[PDB]
Amino acid sequence: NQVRPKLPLLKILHAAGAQGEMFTVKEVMHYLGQYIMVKQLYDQQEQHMVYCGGDLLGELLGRQSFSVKDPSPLYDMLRKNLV
């Protein structure tokens, strides 16, 4: 059960060490979490909060920040970026 991430999401996964074009959603989500850490987008003082307005991840979410505790914007992003 592989999808192909569209370029902007693919760039993001590759930026977290992913290789290739095809992934399971499990992989996608794991690399996304790693990306947030690699790029230090989460707040060390509020570790469920991600400030992504200056990052490609924000453009994809269409949001400047989100909470991993209530991660609503993620779902549509994945629908739009996974073929």
Ligand X SMILES: CN(C)CCCN(C)[C@H]1CCN(C(=O)c2[nH]c3cc(Cl)ccc3c2-c2c(-c3ccccc3)ncn2Cc2ccc(Cl)cc2)C1
Q: Which residues contact ligand X (rule: CB under 6 A)?
A: 3, 25, 29-30, 32-33, 36-37, 42, 47-48, 68, 71, 74-76, 78-80, 82
Q: Is 26 exposed, middle or buried (0-12, 13-18, 19+ CB in 10 A)?
A: exposed
Residue closer to ligand X by CB (options 17, 71) is 71
How far is the C-alpha of 24 from the C-alpha of 37, rounded, in Å?
20
Residue closer to ligand X by CB (options 53, 71) is 71
Strand order in the sheet with 46-51: 42-43, 46-51, 65-67
CB of 19 to ligand X, least distance (A): 18
CB of 42 to ligand X, least distance (A): 4
How far is the C-alpha of 41 from the C-alpha of 25, rounded, in Å?
21
Q: Which residue is nearest to ligand X (CB)?
A: 33
CB of 55 to ligand X, least distance (A): 11
